[PDB]
Each structure stands twice: as C-alpha cells, then as structure tokens.
Amino acid sequence: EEFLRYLWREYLHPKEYEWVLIAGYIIVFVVALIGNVLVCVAVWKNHHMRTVTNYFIVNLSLAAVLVTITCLPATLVVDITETWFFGQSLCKVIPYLQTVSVSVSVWTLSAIALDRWYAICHPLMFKSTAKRARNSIVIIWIVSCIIMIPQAIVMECSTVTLFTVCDERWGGEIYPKMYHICFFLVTYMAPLCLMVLAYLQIFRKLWCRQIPGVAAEIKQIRARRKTARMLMIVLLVFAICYLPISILNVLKRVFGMFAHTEDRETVYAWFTFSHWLVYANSAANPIIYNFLSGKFREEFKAAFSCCCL
Ligand SMILES: Cc1ncc(OC[C@@]2(c3cccc(F)c3)C[C@H]2C(=O)Nc2ccc(F)cn2)c(C)n1
Numbered sequence: 001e002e003f004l005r006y007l008w009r010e011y012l013h014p015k016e017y018e019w020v021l022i023a024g025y026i027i028v029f030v031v032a033l034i035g036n037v038l039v040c041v042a043v044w045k046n047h048h049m050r051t052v053t054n055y056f057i058v059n060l061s062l063a064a065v066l067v068t069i070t071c072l073p074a075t076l077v078v079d080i081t082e083t084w085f086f087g088q089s090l091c092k093v094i095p096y097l098q099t100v101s102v103s104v105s106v107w108t109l110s111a112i113a114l115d116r117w118y119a120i121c122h123p124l125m126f127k128s129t130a131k132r133a134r135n136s137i138v139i140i141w142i143v144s145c146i147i148m149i150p151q152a153i154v155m156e157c158s159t160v161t162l163f164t165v166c167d168e169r170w171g172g173e174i175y176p177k178m179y180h181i182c183f184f185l186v187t188y189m190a191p192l193c194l195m196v197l198a199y200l201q202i203f204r205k206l207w208c209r210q211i212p213g214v215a216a217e218i219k220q221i222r223a224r225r226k227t228a229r230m231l232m233i234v235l236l237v238f239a240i241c242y243l244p245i246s247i248l249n250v251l252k253r254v255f256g257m258f259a260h261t262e263d264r265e266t267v268y269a270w271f272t273f274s275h276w277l278v279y280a281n282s283a284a285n286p287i288i289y290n291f292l293s294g295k296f297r298e299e300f301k302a303a304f305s306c307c308c309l
Helices: 002-012 018-045 052-070 072-081 088-120 130-147 149-153 175-207 215-254 264-292 294-308
Strands: 155-158 165-168
Touching (some): 018 264, 072 088, 088 155, 175 215, 215 264
16 A cells, blocks of 8 residues: 555656666675675685774675665655655664664774774884783774664654655654764764874885885884775765765754755755765775775785686
C-alpha cells in the first residue's frame, strides 16, 4: 500500500533526474565496497604495510563498509521515495550506525594526525605501539557509540497522498538545537580544526625545514613526505565531502532554515547531494590510497591479479 502511494506521489510530482542518482549510488556502493575490502585485505595480508597509520586506515575502511552495506541503500530509498519503508527498529538502528561511523571516521583521521604530529613535530618523535593504536580504535568506537545514543533515542516513524517518514522527534524546540550544535562541533568543526593545525605543523616540519645529514633520516623524511601528502589530500577530500551535509544539518536543526520556504526542490536537491557525498568520500578514499601510496597500489594490483586469474 505504501509503495502504491509512492507511485501516486511520484507521478503527481515527477522528478527529472532520479536515474542519475540511482546510477551514482550504485557506482558509489560498488566502488566503496570493493576498495575498502581491498584496503583491509592488503593491510591484513602483508606485513610491510602494517603501520599504525594503516591500522587506523583499516578501521576507517571497516566503518566505511558498515555504512555502505547498512546505510547506503536506506539513504537512497529515502532520497528517491521520501518514505521510510523499513520500520521503527531498522530506523532506530540505521541513522545511529551512520552517525556512529561518521564520528568514528573523523576521530580516526584525527588519531592519525595526532600520531603523525607526535612522530614528526613533537621533539621526542614518539613511535606509537600497536597496543596504543588498538586501544585508541576501541575507545573511539565506544565513545562514538555512547555519544550517539540520543540520536537513536529521538528517531521515530511519523505517519504524516501522504507518507510515512522516520525523522527526529524531540520534546522541546531548544534541546534539538543544542544537541545538533554539539553534533556539528564534535563530528566536523573541532576535529577538522585540530587536524588542520597538526598537518600545518607537519607540513612546516617536512617541507619547510632543512634536509638532515644522516641518510636514514633522509629516507624517513621522503617516506613521511609521501605519507603526509596522502593524508592531507584525504583530509581535504573528507572536509569537502562532509561540509555540505554538516552545514545543511546546522541550518535545518540549529538555525531552523528551509522551513518557511516553499522551494523544496532546490533544498531537496542540495540535501540529497550532500547525502550522496558522504558515501562518495567513502568510495573515494581507496582511490586516493591507490593513486598516492605505492604499497597500496602494488597490493591492489596483486589482489586484482589473484581474484582475476
Ligand atoms: C536519508 C538521510 N537522511 C538524513 C541523513 O543524514 C542526517 C544526519 C546527519 C547529519 C550530519 C552529518 C551526518 F553524517 C548525518 C542526522 C543523521 C541521520 O539522520 N542519518 C541517517 C538517516 C537516514 C538514513 F537512512 C541513514 N542515516 C542521511 C545521511 N540520509
């Protein structure tokens, strides 16, 4: 019945470019799944790629796979049909997992930046242990799961031809705004500022400093320059892809914009593009790894050769 009502709605409100959205979501799904699985496989199969940065990259790819499997189809269905179709339990699950994984990814990138800063900029050049990396990953996951509990709490399937949509139901008109201010500060603003500061210091230390005399330090500097360039490009892509969705969420929840405007077409186009951009970044990270890491490129080629021959 709900599907029939969608057919009535989509007929009376015909959208021009649903097919390009479907094609883009399918391409993003396939590319993200393949690339993140290949990243995990490449790091886990070989030991020369087993670095703390690569452990954090593996955690990021695991979160990306979780989002791609559990959250991408639901987001596509909601953006196409504007209805939920999945039920109260799946609704309390899927946005919760999506927000948890977004926090996990941003704080994993922050952990990478902090470890690189400790190794490069700190006067002691700390070398992190695998125990510390695994503990950091575990605490990131636990904190992300804890802080997103109210997000899963406020998800409700409203039933307001009409449609059934799962959205955020709050008691007051102030609590959502404070919660979303905190959400924006935790997921996008503060981690991005800290990572920008850390990578600016790293860039000064690696590209604005004299070349040492010891050959081992020279090789270390070259390797760290390549890795830091890859990390900075990954951070820039992440910031670009997550800027629109975070800004739109702030404008809709905190400032209460897009409410009294009857121009839902442009607003919905921007919202669905921002939704697509998150999964697009999830798909683009492995491509960045392939095009900026020689070891990752070689291991992707090796995995392709094994799977195809
Ligand atoms: C359709 C759809 N609606 C809202 C969406 O994002 C809205 C939210 C969000 C804000 C800022 C950054 C984020 F990263 C995610 C609040 C999260 C949610 O409610 N997440 C959520 C909701 C439904 C869903 F299927 C999956 N995730 C998405 C991304 N897709």
